[PDB]
Amino acid sequence: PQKIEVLVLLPQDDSYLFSLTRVRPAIEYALRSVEGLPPGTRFQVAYEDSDCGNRALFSLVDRVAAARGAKPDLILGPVCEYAAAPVARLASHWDLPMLSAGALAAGFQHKDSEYSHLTRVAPAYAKMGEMMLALFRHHHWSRAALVYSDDKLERNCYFTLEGVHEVFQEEGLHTSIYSFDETKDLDLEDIVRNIQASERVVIMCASSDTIRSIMLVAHRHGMTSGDYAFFNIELFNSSSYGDGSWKRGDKHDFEAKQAYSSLQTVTLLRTVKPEFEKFSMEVKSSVEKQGLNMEDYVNMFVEGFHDAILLYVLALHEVLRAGYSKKDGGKIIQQTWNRTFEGIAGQVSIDANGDRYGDFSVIAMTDVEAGTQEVIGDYFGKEGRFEMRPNVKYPWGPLKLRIDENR
Amino acid sequence: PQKIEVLVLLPQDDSYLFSLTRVRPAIEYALRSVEGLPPGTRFQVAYEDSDCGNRALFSLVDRVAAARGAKPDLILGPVCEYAAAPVARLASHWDLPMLSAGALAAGFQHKDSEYSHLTRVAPAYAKMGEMMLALFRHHHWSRAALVYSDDKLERNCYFTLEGVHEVFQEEGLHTSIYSFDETKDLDLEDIVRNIQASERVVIMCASSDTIRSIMLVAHRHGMTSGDYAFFNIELFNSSSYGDGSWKRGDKHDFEAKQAYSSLQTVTLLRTVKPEFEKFSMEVKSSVEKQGLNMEDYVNMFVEGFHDAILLYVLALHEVLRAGYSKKDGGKIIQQTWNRTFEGIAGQVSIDANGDRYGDFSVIAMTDVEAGTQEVIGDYFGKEGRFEMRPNVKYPWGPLKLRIDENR
Ligand SMILES: *[C@H]1O[C@H](CO)[C@@H](O[C@H]2O[C@H](CO)[C@@H](O[C@@H]3O[C@H](CO[C@@H]4O[C@H](CO)[C@@H](O)[C@H](O)[C@@H]4O)[C@@H](O[C@H]4O[C@H](CO)[C@@H](O[C@@H]5O[C@H](CO)[C@@H](O)[C@H](O)[C@@H]5O)[C@H](O)[C@@H]4O)[C@H](O)[C@@H]3O)[C@H](O)[C@H]2NC(C)=O)[C@H](O)[C@H]1NC(C)=O
Ligand SMILES: *[C@H]1O[C@H](CO)[C@@H](O[C@H]2O[C@H](CO)[C@@H](O[C@@H]3O[C@H](CO[C@@H]4O[C@H](CO)[C@@H](O)[C@H](O)[C@@H]4O)[C@@H](O[C@H]4O[C@H](CO)[C@@H](O[C@@H]5O[C@H](CO)[C@@H](O)[C@H](O)[C@@H]5O)[C@H](O)[C@@H]4O)[C@H](O)[C@@H]3O)[C@H](O)[C@H]2NC(C)=O)[C@H](O)[C@H]1NC(C)=O
Numbered sequence: 168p169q170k171i172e173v174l175v176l177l178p179q180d181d182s183y184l185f186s187l188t189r190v191r192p193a194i195e196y197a198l199r200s201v202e203g204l205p206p207g208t209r210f211q212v213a214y215e216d217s218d219c220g221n222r223a224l225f226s227l228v229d230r231v232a233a234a235r236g237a238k239p240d241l242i243l244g245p246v247c248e249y250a251a252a253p254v255a256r257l258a259s260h261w262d263l264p265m266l267s268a269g270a271l272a273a274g275f276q277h278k279d280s281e282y283s284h285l286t287r288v289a290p291a292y293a294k295m296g297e298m299m300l301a302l303f304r305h306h307h308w309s310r311a312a313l314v315y316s317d318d319k320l321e322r323n324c325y326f327t328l329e330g331v332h333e334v335f336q337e338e339g340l341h342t343s344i345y346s347f348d349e350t351k352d353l354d355l356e357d358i359v360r361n362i363q364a365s366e367r368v369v370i371m372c373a374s375s376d377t378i379r380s381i382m383l384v385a386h387r388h389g390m391t392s393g394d395y396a397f398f399n400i401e402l403f404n405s406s407s408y409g410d411g412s413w414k415r416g417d418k419h420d421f422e423a424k425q426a427y428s429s430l431q432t433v434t435l436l437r438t439v440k441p442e443f444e445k446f447s448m449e450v451k452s453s454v455e456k457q458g459l460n461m462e463d464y465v466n467m468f469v470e471g472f473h474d475a476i477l478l479y480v481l482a483l484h485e486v487l488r489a490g491y492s493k494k495d496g497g498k499i500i501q502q503t504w505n506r507t508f509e510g511i512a513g514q515v516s517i518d519a520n521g522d523r524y525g526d527f528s529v530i531a532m533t534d535v536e537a538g539t540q541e542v543i544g545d546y547f548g549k550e551g552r553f554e555m556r557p558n559v560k561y562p563w564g565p566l567k568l569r570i571d572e573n574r
Numbered sequence: 575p576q577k578i579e580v581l582v583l584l585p586q587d588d589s590y591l592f593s594l595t596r597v598r599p600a601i602e603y604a605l606r607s608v609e610g611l612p613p614g615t616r617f618q619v620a621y622e623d624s625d626c627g628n629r630a631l632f633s634l635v636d637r638v639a640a641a642r643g644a645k646p647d648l649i650l651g652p653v654c655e656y657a658a659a660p661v662a663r664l665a666s667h668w669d670l671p672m673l674s675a676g677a678l679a680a681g682f683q684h685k686d687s688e689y690s691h692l693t694r695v696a697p698a699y700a701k702m703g704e705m706m707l708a709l710f711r712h713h714h715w716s717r718a719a720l721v722y723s724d725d726k727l728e729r730n731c732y733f734t735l736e737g738v739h740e741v742f743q744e745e746g747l748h749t750s751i752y753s754f755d756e757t758k759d760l761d762l763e764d765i766v767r768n769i770q771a772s773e774r775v776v777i778m779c780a781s782s783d784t785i786r787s788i789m790l791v792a793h794r795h796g797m798t799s800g801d802y803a804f805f806n807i808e809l810f811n812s813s814s815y816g817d818g819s820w821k822r823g824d825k826h827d828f829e830a831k832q833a834y835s836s837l838q839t840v841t842l843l844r845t846v847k848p849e850f851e852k853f854s855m856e857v858k859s860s861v862e863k864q865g866l867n868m869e870d871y872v873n874m875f876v877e878g879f880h881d882a883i884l885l886y887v888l889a890l891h892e893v894l895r896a897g898y899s900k901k902d903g904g905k906i907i908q909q910t911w912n913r914t915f916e917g918i919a920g921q922v923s924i925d926a927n928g929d930r931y932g933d934f935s936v937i938a939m940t941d942v943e944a945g946t947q948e949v950i951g952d953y954f955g956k957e958g959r960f961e962m963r964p965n966v967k968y969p970w971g972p973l974k975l976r977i978d979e980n981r
């Protein structure tokens with residue numbers, strides 16, 4: 168009765184949204200449920216710090232050399248670009264299956280070889296551009312201002328939007344890019360001004376607050392009344408990037424409530440299924456008990472790794488029946504591509520290239536007086552269509568107007 | 575009486591100038607001479623194919639895991655960028671000393687950490703820019719056309735010249751870049767024309783023949799008589815990049831002889847010391863006997879690795895005396911930096927950052943009738959000065975004129 172041995176390579180520093188501490192709960196939650204459809208086997212999981220860098224490769228390597236050539240049966244992570252690339256190169260070499268909710272970089276989509284043993288469970292950066300482009304086709308838009316902060320680290324926002332940018336170029340849409348890092352004082356006044364003289368549609372990606380601030384300034388300039396379309400992206404369904412919460416409890420709450428009436432927050436497709444609440448509460452509990460309290464406990468990564476466990480099992484089961492073993496990594500990976508199944512937060516489809524299709528929701532303020540938010544549209548990556556949710560009540564408000572770039 | 579174990583990671587494909595077959599002779603030649611100043615120890619060298627890519631990391635890793643955690647005492651190579659980066663990352667991790675005649679990329683000069691255990695024995699791409707810049711200061715030039723072919727592989731030429739470019743930008747020199755790949759038909763006619771309407775000084779990097787061809791076209795346009803300064807770079811002192819040999823034995827020999835009177839070939843500092851002839855003949859012999867006959871047997875890489883062996887020994891000796899062992903890689907590397915010694919092809923100085931200083935020569939035709947080439951200038955990286963060789967007889971010829979960019 169032998170066991171499946173998995174190596175989980177994630178950051179030790181809880182400052183990352185995909186740190187071992189905030190991710191492990193979810194991985195274990197999936198292990199529990201999966202254990203009750205393999206034969207009659209158990210799991211053995213090792214959590215190593217990737218340091219979101221070279222450490223990841225090091226562990227995997229030392230681990231193997233120190234275990235007299237014994238390589239794991241499944242590798243989860245790394246997430247970071249330069250941390251995941253080498254590990255994935257090794258996985259392909261040692262015919263191991265590597266599943267990550269990271270490896271978002273666009274280079275990771277060329278699996279003609281060194282990356283043939285990788286499948287990305289989370290939507291890659293490129294998927295935001297595909298979504299945005301469909302939105303503009305629906306709204307008949309063709310120009311836009313891309314505003315984003317810049318890490319000079321992971322540059323999550325920089326890549327998300329530059330991805331969008333890069334897509335619009337090929338399709339002929341004209342854009343205006345505005346970069347800046349929130350680590351420094353915000354000369355947002357300068358930005359908001361340039362924007363009002365540049366485009367009618369703005370797509371932003373930055374901290375929850377940097378977004379709220381940009382809105383107050385554009386509100387001060389009365390651009391918040393319907394002649395401007397504002398979009399902030401909640402990267403990896405993390406509150407830290409702005410989920411549309413205009414309230415704070417300060418001098419500007421009312422001012423902010425009104426401003427947000429023109430803001431549309433793009434998030435991962437909305438779910439409310441109970442299973443997801445049980446999941447959320449439990450993960451919160453775990454990270455709670457272990458001293459750490461802020462942020463949200465469920466983000467794109469946390470949900471991704473839970474779903475990566477399920478995907479592995481489904482694949483394994485199908486490989487066994489074919490006569491192969493948990494040791495034929497490529498065979499497992501192949502079985503992992505072009506497949507759909509239900510995750511804790513909704514459907515999860517992997518395209519024929521082993522990359523997750525991106526499903527998104529668009530949340531807008533539908534009751535300006537109340538400040539009540541509500542999803543009004545969804546983008547399904549598989550079918551590649553954007554669709555406005557039927558029977559959403561919006562009797563009056565700035566979203567009733569038709570933006571126009573003839574200015 | 576224990577032995578030093580070295581891993582040599584180089585390409586298997588002899589199409590590379592630094593392939594295991596063309597490099598090994600030189601490494602062995604250095605091993606022989608070194609063996610007669612360590613104690614009373616011998617060497618043990620393993621030659622693994624790097625595939626000029628991921629293979630390098632793989633071997634090093636499998637090799638170690640398969641030898642129950644036994645890591646070599648010295649790693650030679652890889653040369654290729656993406657092949658050497660990971661190996662060097664591991665070296666730093668396993669406190670191993672890595673010496674390469676490659677790792678020419680500019681990122682490899684930041685040894686604040688992941689690259690702290692690397693020392694580059696060959697002059698890095700950046701060194702060409704430092705040399706060229708000094709030449710222009712001496713010639714009082716300030717504008718130039720950078721012509722180079724483009725691999726879309728290693729892009730040796732692309733990087734050499736873009737390095738020069740990148741340096742001129744910071745120093746305020748204006749440039750014109752002309753890219754093209756010799757894999758396709760050469761529309762050189764278009765180039766030569768643009769150039770004559772652009773600058774008076776041209777710096778090229780491309781195959782021996784692509785250079786000879788560019789010269790015949792510029793000669794056909796009579797730009798070869800002294801109003802234009804032509805420079806081709808003999809990358810890694812390899813004939814394949816043009817060493818100034820205008821003769822071929824075709825219809826155009828005479829035409830070419832005249833054209834080359836305006837060409838100045840930049841090579842690695844010239845040597846004629848006997849030891850270097852013995853070295854050259856022997857390496858030629860080895861690669862000869864082993865079925866392979868073209869190209870030249872001594873290039874920057876071949877000489878580099880011979881010199882890397884000597885540098886290791888010098889360092890080791892100094893580490894022992896300090897009370898450390900062949901196992902303190904960093905200690906050895908440190909002892910390898912900021913050091914000068916005589917190699918088989920002349921002095922070799924390593925700067926305080928562990929990078930070789932570039933010493934170059936400039937060969938020009940000093941007897942236009944005869945077609946006789948001769949070095950007329952040298953650039954010493956350490957002192958960073960360009961100097962024209964005294965008492966070189968040039969009574970008449972296009973090199974007697976003073977180029978002028980007032981056109
Ligand atoms: C990524 O990010 C986006 C943006 O945030 C997500 O958007 C959604 O976020 C959550 C996901 O479920 C939704 O909120 C949840 O909705 C539950 C149902 O609410 C009903 O709707 C009305 C609306 O007026 C509400 O007032 C009423 O309560 C309805 O039931 C609801 O569940 C939560 O309930 C408690 C609130 O803290 C709490 O206790 C639980 O109670 C239930 C009731 O039996 C049980 O499950 C159990 O007993 C629990 O104890 C618990 O926290 C529950 O979660 C809450 O309203 C809950 O917040 C958002 O509506 C939705 N966002 C919007 C604006 O549409 C995406 O879903 C996400 N996507 C991905 C891919 O991750
Ligand atoms: C990288 O690339 C550049 C560009 O090519 C190099 O430039 C130099 O290249 C070589 C390096 O040594 C030089 O050529 C060698 O010079 C030897 C001395 O020649 C003398 O000068 C006159 C010039 O008119 C010459 O006619 C006369 O012969 C003088 O002796 C000479 O040695 C070679 O001799 C034989 C030729 O094939 C051959 O046999 C040997 O004979 C000698 C004699 O006793 C002994 O060593 C032994 O018996 C051998 O059997 C052997 O091949 C010898 O090498 C040849 O002229 C030889 O080619 C170039 O002059 C010089 N280039 C120029 C134009 O200046 C750089 O040096 C190089 N740098 C680096 C860092 O690698």
Ligand SMILES: *[C@@H]1O[C@H](CO[C@@H]2O[C@@H](C)[C@@H](O)[C@@H](O)[C@@H]2O)[C@@H](O[C@@H]2O[C@H](CO)[C@@H](O[C@H]3O[C@H](CO)[C@@H](O[C@@H]4O[C@H](CO)[C@@H](O)[C@H](O)[C@@H]4O)[C@H](O)[C@@H]3O)[C@H](O)[C@H]2NC(C)=O)[C@H](O)[C@H]1NC(C)=O
Pocket residue numbers: 505506507519
């Ligand atoms: C990738 O997966 C799909 C399977 O579909 C998906 O997977 C399921 C589990 C769910 O996730 C779904 O959401 C997805 O649909 C494979 O792709 C191709 O699937 C199509 C059908 O989806 C299949 O088509 C064959 O059959 C059609 C008929 O449907 C034939 O085409 C025409 O049919 C009409 C009549 O319907 C005739 O009048 C025409 O003459 C013509 O025949 C034809 O026979 C198709 O071959 C298709 O074969 C299949 N593969 C292809 C060709 O891309 C992939 O195989 C999976 N992996 C990949 C992409 O390689």
Ligand SMILES: *[C@@H]1O[C@H](CO[C@@H]2O[C@@H](C)[C@@H](O)[C@@H](O)[C@@H]2O)[C@@H](O[C@@H]2O[C@H](CO)[C@@H](O[C@H]3O[C@H](CO)[C@@H](O[C@@H]4O[C@H](CO)[C@@H](O)[C@H](O)[C@@H]4O)[C@H](O)[C@@H]3O)[C@H](O)[C@H]2NC(C)=O)[C@H](O)[C@H]1NC(C)=O
Pocket residue numbers: 912913914926
């Ligand atoms: C890097 O190596 C050099 C050593 O020099 C090199 O190595 C030798 C083996 C050969 O390869 C040579 O080609 C090279 O020269 C170290 O760099 C610095 O070296 C200098 C001298 O080269 C040294 O200077 C100290 O001494 C000077 C006097 O020479 C003092 O400076 C002034 O001196 C005048 C009188 O001469 C006084 O009137 C002034 O008041 C003033 O004192 C001063 O004391 C200098 O410290 C220097 O100390 C040394 N290191 C420094 C400071 O960079 C490096 O140590 C090696 N590694 C590195 C770069 O860290």
Ligand SMILES: [Cl-]
Pocket residue numbers: 176177178217218219220244245246247250251
């Ligand atoms: Cl990571």
Ligand SMILES: [Cl-]
Pocket residue numbers: 222225667
């Ligand atoms: Cl480490």
Ligand SMILES: [Cl-]
Pocket residue numbers: 583584585624625626627651652653654657658
């Ligand atoms: Cl290599």
Ligand SMILES: [Cl-]
Pocket residue numbers: 260629632
């Ligand atoms: Cl391989």
